Amino acid sequence: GEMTFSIPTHKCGLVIGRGGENVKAINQQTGAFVEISRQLPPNGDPNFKLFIIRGSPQQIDHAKQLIEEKIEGPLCPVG
């Protein structure tokens, strides 16, 4: 099951780069596809873009770690 994480819209330039650059490098490092979602977060606020780490748990969780390395902060599993 693909997992969703809360990615701040303002941080879409460090982890997301310009058009999802760094996120696909995460994929290469892991295996799961870290793709930008169109889902509304629990808060329904447009400053929190949901991010899809779609793959197998082992790949997702490892990619999660790499993103939490990018932002150097904890990501919350949403859905």
Q: How many C-beta atoms lie closer than 10 Å to residue 17's C-beta?
A: 13
Contact between 39 and 28 under an 8 Å Cβ cutoff? The reply is: no
Cα(51)–Cα(39) distance, rounded to whole angstroms? 8
Dmax (CA) for the chain in angstroms is: 31
Report the b/e string of 29-57 with b at 16+ CB within 10 A: ebebbbeebeeebeeeeeebbbbbbbbee
Spell out the domain ranges in the chain: 1-79
Pick the CATH number of 1-79 from 3.30.830.10, 3.40.140.10, 3.30.1370.10, 3.40.50.300: 3.30.1370.10
DSSP for 36-56?
A: E--PPPTT--TTEEEEEEES-
Q: Which residues of the chain come before a gap where C and the next N are over 2.5 Å apart?
A: none
